[PDB]
């Protein structure tokens, strides 16, 4: 025997295959597994891992956010160079709060119809990953982006709302029911809003 106490606690849970049933997703996974194995770019490896990931971990992104980050990168770029291609492993959605945008080249798994119309009208192009693999096989001159995950209702609900320093929402259908005792100083006590950690 060999003393290997608590050795199973160093194992990590990682997904090695997709749970999706989409044949086009499977084709993309095949192509980018080949590219990641046979090239020396970190871009391909990151893209392959994100393609493997699940739907909840592939949050969508906003066209306005894309425009803002592209502008903040472009303000410090020489005028003799071309703007990078935005790349999102996920969905791109339109934004009504911003009406004027520059011409951008965007590659994504899926576009909403409004977002596609807005990009084309501004004067950009919508690309797919198979087109990207031919335009830039190693991912040179790209801009990898992710969508926002905090702000989801589930995240806002995570935790216990009755302990000091917590601001999570309780699971309740009647908004006016869980007030009074434990939430007001006049009713016995009030949950403390702040606590040093």
């Amino acid at each position: 025997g060999v003393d290997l106490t608590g050795i199973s606690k160093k194992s990590r849970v990682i997904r090695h295959h997709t749970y999706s049933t989409n044949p086009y997703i499977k084709l993309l996974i095949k192509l980018y597994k080949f590219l990641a194995k046979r090239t020396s770019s970190g871009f391909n490896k990151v893209v392959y891992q994100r393609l493997i990931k699940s739907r909840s971990n592939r949050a969508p992104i906003s066209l306005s956010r894309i425009a803002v980050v592209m502008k903040r990168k472009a303000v410090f770029t020489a005028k003799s160079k071309a703007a990078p291609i935005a790349v999102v492993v996920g969905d791109v959605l339109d934004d009504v709060r911003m009406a004027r945008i520059p011409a951008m080249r965007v590659c994504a798994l899926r576009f909403s119809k409004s977002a596609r119309q807005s990009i084309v009208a501004a004067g950009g192009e919508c690309l797919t990953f198979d087109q990207l693999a031919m335009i830039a096989p190693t991912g040179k001159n790209t801009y990898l982006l992710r969508g926002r995950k905090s702000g989801r209702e589930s995240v806002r609900h995570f935790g216990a709302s009755g302990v000091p320093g917590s601001h999570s929402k309780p699971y309740a259908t009647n908004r006016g029911k869980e007030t009074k005792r434990g939430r007001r100083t006049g009713r016995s006590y009030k949950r403390k809003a702040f606590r040093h950690v």
Binding site: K9, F76, V197
Partner: protein
């Protein structure tokens, strides 16, 4: 019938199975709430001035870069 009252026999082993985790480093969660108020107020005035200086500095960098 009577039973066991209290013991601490196995508790140390349970606490070390997932280890006793160390403290959070000092540069995180260093909130100043509840400290001596007169010093807190004066520090707020300085931080407000610094933010305005940071915005001005970025504008100068942009203009210089555009001029090449």
């Amino acid at each position: 019938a009577k039973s066991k009252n209290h013991t601490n026999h196995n508790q140390s082993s349970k606490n070390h199975r997932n280890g006793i985790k160390g403290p959070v480093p000092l540069h995180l969660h260093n909130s100043k709430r509840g400290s001596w108020l007169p010093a807190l107020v004066n520090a707020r005035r300085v931080r407000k001035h610094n933010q305005k200086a940071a915005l001005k500095k970025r504008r100068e960098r942009i203009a210089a870069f555009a001029a090449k």
